[PDB]
């Protein structure tokens, strides 16, 4: 069973949990969003060949968005979003209301979601994301990373 | 010349930089205090026997503090804090303004500094603080982490 | 790309090299023997979902054998052998003769291959062998070992 | 606690253990040898300062030898030698007798002691060694290895 060096969870403690776990790097992004981040399902890299992690997608007829990354000459140095609880949506507790990625490349993919409630930012100077973790109910309630060298 | 995943480095450009490495685990943190973060020192465990860091002290004449962390059953579980410039030391840059530990045994050393500015949360689900990085001038411009299993 | 810890290649520069990479364990073993190994292919562990690697099989009509471990309670703790070049397969470079691995549990795989030639062994303290890397051609010239905590 | 993948343990039961720990790389490395490997201490590299570990030296009247590596430009890359009994120093278990080092920039430190016994062997492809446990009573029972990338 080897292990990952796992952090964060951002967000609140709604809908399910979920890990997809450790892989070799992160080719390909894919989620929804409008008022917050719904769907959220990652294209990972297996030793070479791409892998499609379990899909966390949401019903919300929401806005989706493919992240591309340039693999593996580009990959995220910099994880940043914002949490707090959605009105709309009757939940008492905390979602991940934007979610903004910004790669090595200088490539940044501008803020999905509305920017309100408590920031959160993930700069990574050394090290890579290997894997996500988060929890899923009607939206992404919160995320969590997975990293290594 | 050993790596370690290197996370974050909250905080503005100002002062000097400073890496104090990667050590086996943290004993004690020393770190003085009053409107924003100033001196900032730590002693590390070194295989067993305690090995105190480079020592990165302010002049300002703040309130000091030391964090004994009941090593090796306690560690750091959570960093967190805020960041924001400082108006009375004429600075244009961000600065440390709080920063609060929280340890695995329910131990949270409570806010030192100035909750103002933007916040920054570093939740560790898996892994270890095995040393911190960092900017400092007069005060603790900003702090970085080295993590691993 | 999140490299992992390889060690080794015990064995001979012949056959073509292959590289099945990191997983998060390993679930099964399969090999064919005779006067030395040929045909070696594994099933790997993704994250709780066994995964089966490339097939590395060689035409020698040998006796096969598969190694199935307790996972994820049971792991390799020890993986040792002989490397030698051999007469009856015309080639003048060394081939991995034999193989034997040992589990934390107690349980050794006995010696497949005959045992003569070099003598290499790698006793594990503290690590897992997460993938395998080698040297195929109608034997197996060479093998090496991927690790991780 | 920060733990370090830690691998083999090669040569006998007998003398005293004791484990140097991780460090940054390595620095200098100094044996005594004449018919067996003897006095064995090492100066690792601690953060980019060169640190001294504990000195584990035999009184048998051994020829010594310095191992000066051109840190950081020049690592180990390879670690093998000879481990058996030792008539001479009536001991009934295997002590390592002979101990040889190579170096990525092509440096072979020629075998130390004498070359008879089992044989042991690490090639590292990817990765360093960053400390070494081991067992001295009179000489150098075992030897061990930390690696890290
Ligand atoms: C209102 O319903 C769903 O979505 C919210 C937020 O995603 C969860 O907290 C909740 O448990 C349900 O899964
Ligand atoms: C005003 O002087 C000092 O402290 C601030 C904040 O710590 C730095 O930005 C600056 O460069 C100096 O080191
Ligand atoms: C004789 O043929 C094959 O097998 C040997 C040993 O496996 C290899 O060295 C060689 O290149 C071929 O692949
Ligand atoms: C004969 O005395 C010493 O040295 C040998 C080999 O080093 C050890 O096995 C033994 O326990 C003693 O420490």
């Given at each position: 069973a080897?292990?990952?060096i796992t952090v964060?969870s951002?967000?609140?403690?709604?809908?399910?949990?979920?890990?997809?776990?450790?892989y070799?790097?992160?080719?390909?992004?894919?989620?929804?969003?409008?008022?917050?981040?719904?769907?959220?399902?990652?294209?990972?890299?297996?030793?070479?060949?791409?892998?499609?992690?379990?899909?966390?997608?949401?019903?919300?007829?929401?806005?989706?968005?493919?992240?591309?990354?340039?693999?593996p000459?580009?990959?995220?140095?910099?994880?940043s979003?914002?949490?707090?609880?959605?009105?709309?949506?009757?939940?008492?507790?905390?979602?991940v209301?934007?979610?903004?990625?910004?790669?090595?490349?200088?490539?940044?993919?501008?803020?999905?979601?509305?920017?309100?409630?408590?920031?959160?930012?993930?700069?990574?100077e050394?090290?890579?994301?290997?894997?996500?973790?988060?929890?899923?109910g009607?939206?992404?309630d919160?995320?969590g990373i997975?990293?290594?060298?």
């Amino acid at each position: 069973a080897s292990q990952t060096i796992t952090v964060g969870s951002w967000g609140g403690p709604g809908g399910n949990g979920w890990d997809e776990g450790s892989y070799t790097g992160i080719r390909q992004i894919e989620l929804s969003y409008k008022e917050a981040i719904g769907s959220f399902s990652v294209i990972y890299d297996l030793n070479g060949d791409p892998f499609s992690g379990p899909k966390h997608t949401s019903k919300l007829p929401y806005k989706n968005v493919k992240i591309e990354l340039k693999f593996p000459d580009e990959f995220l140095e910099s994880v940043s979003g914002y949490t707090g609880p959605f009105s709309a949506l009757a939940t008492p507790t905390p979602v991940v209301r934007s979610l903004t990625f910004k790669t090595n490349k200088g490539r940044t993919f501008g803020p999905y979601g509305d920017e309100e409630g408590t920031y959160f930012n993930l700069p990574i100077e050394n090290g890579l994301i290997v894997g996500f973790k988060g929890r899923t109910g009607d939206l992404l309630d919160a995320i969590g990373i997975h990293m290594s060298l």
